Design an enzyme around this catalytic site. Structure first.
Site, PDB file in Angstrom:
ATOM      1  N   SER A 138      -5.990  19.386 -16.989  1.00 24.98           N
ATOM      2  CA  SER A 138      -4.921  20.136 -16.334  1.00 24.98           C
ATOM      3  C   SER A 138      -5.350  20.419 -14.910  1.00 24.98           C
ATOM      4  O   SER A 138      -5.766  19.529 -14.176  1.00 24.98           O
ATOM      5  CB  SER A 138      -4.474  21.425 -17.042  1.00 24.98           C
ATOM      6  OG  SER A 138      -5.354  21.539 -18.135  1.00 24.98           O
ATOM      7  N   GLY A 167       4.881  17.676 -34.415  1.00 23.27           N
ATOM      8  CA  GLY A 167       3.470  17.563 -34.090  1.00 23.27           C
ATOM      9  C   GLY A 167       2.952  18.262 -32.844  1.00 23.27           C
ATOM     10  O   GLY A 167       1.792  18.684 -32.825  1.00 23.27           O
ATOM     11  N   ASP A 176       4.263  16.838 -21.643  1.00 24.31           N
ATOM     12  CA  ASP A 176       3.279  16.958 -22.710  1.00 24.31           C
ATOM     13  C   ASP A 176       3.267  18.368 -23.271  1.00 24.31           C
ATOM     14  O   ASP A 176       2.288  18.814 -23.873  1.00 24.31           O
ATOM     15  CB  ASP A 176       1.881  16.636 -22.193  1.00 24.31           C
ATOM     16  CG  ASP A 176       1.296  17.714 -21.292  1.00 24.31           C
ATOM     17  OD1 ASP A 176       2.012  18.679 -20.931  1.00 24.31           O
ATOM     18  OD2 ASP A 176       0.096  17.619 -20.931  1.00 24.31           O
ATOM     19  N   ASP A 223      -0.353  15.658 -26.854  1.00 26.47           N
ATOM     20  CA  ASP A 223       0.052  16.796 -26.044  1.00 26.47           C
ATOM     21  C   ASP A 223      -1.085  17.452 -25.279  1.00 26.47           C
ATOM     22  O   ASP A 223      -2.264  17.130 -25.427  1.00 26.47           O
ATOM     23  CB  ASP A 223       0.895  17.790 -26.837  1.00 26.47           C
ATOM     24  CG  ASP A 223       0.104  18.897 -27.493  1.00 26.47           C
ATOM     25  OD1 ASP A 223      -1.096  19.125 -27.223  1.00 26.47           O
ATOM     26  OD2 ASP A 223       0.705  19.601 -28.333  1.00 26.47           O
ATOM     27  N   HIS A 224      -0.653  18.394 -24.449  1.00 28.17           N
ATOM     28  CA  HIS A 224      -1.533  19.043 -23.491  1.00 28.17           C
ATOM     29  C   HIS A 224      -2.739  19.613 -24.222  1.00 28.17           C
ATOM     30  O   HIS A 224      -3.859  19.509 -23.732  1.00 28.17           O
ATOM     31  CB  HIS A 224      -0.778  20.174 -22.791  1.00 28.17           C
ATOM     32  CG  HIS A 224      -1.413  20.587 -21.503  1.00 28.17           C
ATOM     33  ND1 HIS A 224      -1.363  19.795 -20.377  1.00 28.17           N
ATOM     34  CD2 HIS A 224      -2.118  21.697 -21.174  1.00 28.17           C
ATOM     35  CE1 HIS A 224      -2.006  20.410 -19.401  1.00 28.17           C
ATOM     36  NE2 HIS A 224      -2.473  21.558 -19.857  1.00 28.17           N
ATOM     37  N   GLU A 256      -3.640  18.864 -27.516  1.00 28.57           N
ATOM     38  CA  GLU A 256      -4.211  17.921 -28.469  1.00 28.57           C
ATOM     39  C   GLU A 256      -5.302  17.109 -27.784  1.00 28.57           C
ATOM     40  O   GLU A 256      -6.257  16.652 -28.414  1.00 28.57           O
ATOM     41  CB  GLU A 256      -3.126  16.968 -28.979  1.00 28.57           C
ATOM     42  CG  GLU A 256      -2.130  17.628 -29.920  1.00 28.57           C
ATOM     43  CD  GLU A 256      -1.022  16.672 -30.330  1.00 28.57           C
ATOM     44  OE1 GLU A 256      -0.757  15.684 -29.614  1.00 28.57           O
ATOM     45  OE2 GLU A 256      -0.409  16.922 -31.385  1.00 28.57           O
ATOM     46  N   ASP A 259      -5.420  21.612 -30.193  1.00 24.20           N
ATOM     47  CA  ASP A 259      -4.423  21.531 -31.250  1.00 24.20           C
ATOM     48  C   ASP A 259      -4.740  20.232 -31.993  1.00 24.20           C
ATOM     49  O   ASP A 259      -5.183  19.269 -31.365  1.00 24.20           O
ATOM     50  CB  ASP A 259      -3.045  21.424 -30.597  1.00 24.20           C
ATOM     51  CG  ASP A 259      -1.925  21.360 -31.617  1.00 24.20           C
ATOM     52  OD1 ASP A 259      -1.555  22.448 -32.117  1.00 24.20           O
ATOM     53  OD2 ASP A 259      -1.391  20.279 -31.959  1.00 24.20           O
ATOM     54  N   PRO A 260      -4.514  20.191 -33.302  1.00 22.78           N
ATOM     55  CA  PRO A 260      -4.905  19.029 -34.107  1.00 22.78           C
ATOM     56  C   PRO A 260      -3.972  17.838 -33.943  1.00 22.78           C
ATOM     57  O   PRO A 260      -2.787  18.018 -33.673  1.00 22.78           O
ATOM     58  CB  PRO A 260      -4.840  19.525 -35.553  1.00 22.78           C
ATOM     59  CG  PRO A 260      -4.036  20.807 -35.528  1.00 22.78           C
ATOM     60  CD  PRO A 260      -3.867  21.251 -34.095  1.00 22.78           C
TER      61      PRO A 260
END
Ligand SMILES: [Ca+2]
Ligand SMILES: [Ca+2]
Ligand SMILES: [Zn+2]
Ligand SMILES: [Zn+2]
Lengths: 388, 388
Positions: free
Chosen positions: B113, B286, B317, B357-358, B360, B365-366
């Site tokens: 980020s 997800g 994301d 995602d941001h 994951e 996050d899983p």
């Protein structure tokens, strides 16, 4: 016998694969290689019709499509729902199979697999409608389907067969995406339909008008499935895939409850054996080959103690864990009771467990020791016997 | 495989959330619920270190803090900068993770980020210093950090992952302030830290000494965040909040340029699908729950024609607009080139867009379908191959 106590017609509803009578060159989902279930029922005096809804679509969408196919009209998915998920509000238009539903007629729904979730959700919508759709309608000044109002009731009974009321752990397999669509392909092949040919005619319509998804002129099922895998009917939460998961199923269960006005019957299936000195379950001889090689072993071993996925989850029918099938339990307060000879309204009458796999119970995979015509005829006679 | 061509250690740099190895008791920003990425790189022969700077502070302040965390010493924000924004000139003192850098050798920076902005800023300061801090020092007879002198070529590469190089529209949401602190609350809860408990130990230190802000022991995070919202680290232009905005990011891009002696790599992320007829983007099944409910909808539909925030900005994301990630463009002359097998110096090597995602992508996050270990081991191997 039982004595006929009601004249309600039967309606058949498929799961995450399924198609209508004119589709798939006429090879039937309800009966498969064994024959035609609808025709047998009709021939034996039990009026029966078949529904065709989106196999990959969410229970909500399927329930909206079903209502429209039953009463007649254009599928109306709800302005709120459709804005939230980014698909069209309106689907296809239907003549209506049973317009008498608007004046007091009723039906019996017999549903297989995920069809059982869809059936439950339709009864819950009829009865309670949707608060969110009612409030969105007045706030945005747009019309509102009667389905979201509530105070409609037209399902006398719902019977479910091999339904993942609590989800299936199959969705937790690593390559679930590719394996799920190879399963679709296998079902195509049981119907003598190839997955590498650009059939000019449709043969298996996914009913994805809301998402603008349609098999293209010149495209095979292999290529179509690769696109579906990358599209919203596979990657959003408004899908069969999400509703099939243990967590998705629990969320549905939190709002889709049994109606006191409706008899629920559940049939469970299993086709595995318990291994030696393991709690693991393994596919029995005769299980459809795809599931026996690809799904049954994961299902018969995957555990998640933290989430309560224990020993009792390993027995399966090749696609769904058997414990998930007697009725919704996770995130639900419905009552489930063992059948004792008298069916009761407003609870799940657990009609027991049958030694038959997921595709055998519908005829799609053969099983000569399973007398499928007697199974359905006997179920029809019980439904026929329900008091109004 | 390939051949190794440098010995340059890897340094990890977080974004607008992030904390040190011993904070959040053990739960690691780099790896989260999947493990400890620094540890994997070390165990596989890729020497790696972790920086922890103020999560809400401006890129400038983070850069100064990063400099001193690397070479050792007392943080020095620059006398001109400090008097201009009204915070302390000096911050914490560190031993240094790689003081050897003062005399040669190099590092690879991998940053997620907003860390990506910070990394780019550090490189620019290392190489060019700050003319402004130079003049101030001379005009006032005051000391000067070697950081502002220029002429230090410590960084061989900068790799960015989900960085908002042109900013993110999340900052434009009506209740961004409240929702942003809920985001922080959600990352805490991913590490099992509650936001209503008066923790005695720091747990997650915002490193706001320059501003005199620190949580009082026994003050909950809820209460602390309420004070942060009304404090200069939320309200001034010297903050992460401003540099993460579209205009703030364009301002940074107007002066932080790509250095000719450094390799830049960017990784882009996305986790949304395009709606059938709206052009809008919607979160995929997800995506971490907080984002999916509170952030991704706004991101995938907010447009501002005046500023060219288009259909192309809508893919995201869950935190950042994907288009912002391949490299600085708004207010920049940096060149960005698709990766073609060979990494080039002084330009942005766009390594692609990943369906993650941001959160994951750092394991917070899983996402079982994402092989996070191989993603990091491959990157390390690529960085090890760079010709100095
Ligand atoms: Ca068989
Ligand atoms: Ca996830
Ligand atoms: Zn829908
Ligand atoms: Zn500052």
């Amino acid at each position: 016998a039982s004595l006929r106590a009601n004249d309600a017609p039967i309606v058949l509803l498929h799961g995450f694969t399924g198609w209508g009578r004119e589709e798939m060159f006429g090879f039937k989902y309800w009966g498969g290689v064994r024959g035609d279930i609808e025709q047998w029922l009709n021939d034996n005096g039990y009026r029966t019709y078949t529904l065709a809804v989106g196999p990959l679509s969410s229970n909500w969408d399927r329930v909206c499509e079903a209502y429209v196919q039953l009463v007649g009209g254009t599928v109306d998915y709800g302005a709120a729902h459709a804005a939230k998920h980014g698909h069209a509000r309106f689907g296809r238009t239907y003549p209506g199979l049973l317009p008498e539903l608007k004046r007091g007629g009723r039906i019996h729904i017999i549903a297989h697999s995920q069809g059982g979730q869809t059936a439950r959700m339709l009864v819950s919508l009829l009865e309670n409608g949707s608060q969110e759709e009612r409030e969105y309608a007045k706030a945005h000044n747009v019309s509102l389907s009667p389905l979201f109002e509530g105070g409609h009731h037209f399902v006398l009974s719902v019977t479910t067969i091999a339904t993942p009321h609590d989800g299936t752990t199959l969705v937790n397999m690593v390559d679930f995406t590719d394996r799920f669509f190879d399963l679709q392909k296998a079902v195509l092949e049981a119907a003598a339909v190839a997955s590498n040919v650009p059939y000019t005619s449709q043969v298996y319509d996914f009913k994805l008008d809301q998402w603008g998804l349609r098999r293209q002129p010149g495209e095979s099922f292999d290529h179509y499935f690769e696109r579906l895998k990358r599209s919203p009917v596979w990657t959003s939460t408004d899908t069969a895939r999400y509703d099939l998961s243990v967590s998705g199923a629990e969320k549905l269960n939190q709002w889709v409850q049994a109606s006191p006005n409706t008899y629920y019957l559940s049939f469970s299936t299993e086709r595995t054996y318990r291994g030696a000195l393991t709690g693991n379950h393994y596919p029995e001889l005769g299980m459809n080959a795809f599931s026996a090689v690809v799904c049954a072993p994961f299902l018969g071993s995957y555990r998640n103690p933290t989430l309560g996925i224990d020993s009792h989850w390993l027995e399966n029918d090749g696609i769904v864990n058997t414990i998930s099938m007697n009725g919704p339990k996770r995130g639900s307060n419905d009552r489930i009771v063992p059948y004792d000879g008298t069916l009761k309204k407003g609870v799940w009458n657990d009609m027991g467990t049958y030694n038959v796999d997921h595709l055998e119970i519908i005829g799609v995979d053969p099983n000569p020791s399973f007398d499928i015509r007697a199974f359905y005829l006997r179920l029809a006679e019980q439904l026929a016997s329900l008091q109004p």
